Amino acid sequence: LPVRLCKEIELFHFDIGPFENMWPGIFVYMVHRSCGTSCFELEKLCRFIMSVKKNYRRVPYHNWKHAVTVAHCMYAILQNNHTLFTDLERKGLLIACLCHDLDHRGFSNSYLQKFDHPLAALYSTSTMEQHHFSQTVSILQLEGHNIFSTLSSSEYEQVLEIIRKAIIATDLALYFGNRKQLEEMYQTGSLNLNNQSHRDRVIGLMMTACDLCSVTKLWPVTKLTANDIYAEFWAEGDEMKKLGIQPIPMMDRDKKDEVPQGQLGFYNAVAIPCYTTLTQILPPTEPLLKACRDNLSQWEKVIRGE
Amino acid sequence: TSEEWQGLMQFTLPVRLCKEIELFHFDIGPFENMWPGIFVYMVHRSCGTSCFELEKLCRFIMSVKKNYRRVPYHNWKHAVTVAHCMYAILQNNHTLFTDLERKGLLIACLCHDLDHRGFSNSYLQKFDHPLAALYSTSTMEQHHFSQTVSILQLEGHNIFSTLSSSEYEQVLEIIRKAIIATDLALYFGNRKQLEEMYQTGSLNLNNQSHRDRVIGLMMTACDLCSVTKLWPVTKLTANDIYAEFWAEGDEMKKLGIQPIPMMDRDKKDEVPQGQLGFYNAVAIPCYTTLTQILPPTEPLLKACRDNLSQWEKVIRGE
Ligand SMILES: CNc1cc(-c2cccnc2Oc2ccc(Nc3nc4ccc(F)c(F)c4[nH]3)cc2)ccn1
Ligand SMILES: CNc1cc(-c2cccnc2Oc2ccc(Nc3nc4ccc(F)c(F)c4[nH]3)cc2)ccn1
């Protein structure tokens, strides 16, 4: 890995760059540094990464780049709270992040439900997410893709459960209740990492934090990333109008000029609470929150027209 | 029901102590009959008001008090002070520790110098004291745990009587290990091992042996906390530490042995150097490593560093 990369990949606000064919290397480097060189047989891990790459789609935002970007955010959390995590979590969380939007079409669970898509009948709740985990399992069962083959049966069931819960937690609908419970557990001191269900919840929050990490980048990356977010959402809003459903203003390209107030509302309602609470629980994740605020400042500055 | 009347109640300190006992550099003050209350409070906030049966807990504390001796440093005040530091470490890392570990660690700290006579393991060995024949390493520390177990065996004194046998044994191990770890001789090996494990990333709190080591370093850090207090307190506490050591040096001379300069009253003027050496060689690396493993314990390092500054100021003569 190049000098600049080695240094800057430790920073929370690292951008993985425009060279797609370095991203596998970057991910492998992150597994090595946060899990270990002997965590995975290198050959199987490359075949697995490439097969995952292949089942991500050429969509504006929810693509291979976002999959690797999210995994990096996870990496930086792992490295800055490294004593906290089991060897199983050191193995399965980065993988969970890399697989967490497998085969995303660029469409919400709402759209899938309104369209009456087969996945909506097959998975009634967190529809895309149950699908991302189903894709993950089936890639794992391809000959030579069981990167967990040396684990015991028990250890294999456990890490898949980590991957499952982690991926499900990326459904933004579950985030609100989850963060409420965690807030109230931290204020009252009941929160405890020796309690599996509390540990699950924190991982869930770590995953929301990683999924939304584009708001913790420096302003130029965050602004440019917003073009990609909205390109998807506007395409979905287009498809809503074709069904004959007025889409919400978030996904309606005719409301472009209201994007700045749109972002502001979201940093206040969702992103700031998310990272604020995560910073309470894992203080060394503060740089994420700090960046989020700087970007919240930049949207107000945009709204003022300066 | 008593578990029920104890659930309604919460213990209350004066306003100044409520606020400042949360601070790492808090001093427990000169009022001895306040310290039990101080301890019970810390137990209630870091553990919960149903961890111990209050009557049993008071009986236990009075017995522990009665088994500390009237020596200048390793006395009842020291015990409670060490327990406080552990309380602050617990409160600032609240999501890390089990209920048992919280129960047991505060109790361990309070009991960790039980029946200390003001003499090092080294003096006991040279004196040929009976304890040295019985415990050939960490002599005093095994005795401290031994006394602890004896207090718990007294009628109406088993504060862990409500635990399952399984949990009782776990807490007694947490306490045994913790107390043994205050043998400063074992600290150097322990810290070195943790510094390596932290730097390579192998350090993992879900592994019992690693966790034991961290707990060990936590115990060292609390044991030496006198160096993390504000300057006026560290300077004054220093009198008490040297009163002890000098008296040991006196007893070594009585055996016809030259005591090391650290325990030799004839070398009063080299104390500033001596402390400079100790901060450089022991205290700074201890809290440096602890702050590394547990970032919220930093204020201990910051304060340790400020006192190192004060000792240099004395050496220069300023
Ligand atoms: C909603 N879940 C989600 C969010 C993001 C996301 C991550 C980081 C930043 N933004 C993200 O998406 C959002 C985009 C817009 C909004 N809110 C919003 N935009 C508006 C534009 C016009 C308008 F009139 C509005 F009312 C808008 N509201 C929120 C998240 C990505 C994927 N899924
Ligand atoms: C060593 N074990 C120990 C130390 C302390 C302790 C805690 C905080 C501060 N000091 C402590 O004890 C020490 C006292 C002195 C030294 N070093 C030292 N002092 C000297 C004075 C004169 C002289 F000539 C010297 F060489 C000295 N060396 C270290 C710890 C408490 C309990 N056990």
Ligand SMILES: [Zn+2]
């Ligand atoms: Zn998703």
Ligand SMILES: [Zn+2]
């Ligand atoms: Zn996502």
Ligand SMILES: [Zn+2]
């Ligand atoms: Zn001791």
Ligand SMILES: [Zn+2]
């Ligand atoms: Zn002690």
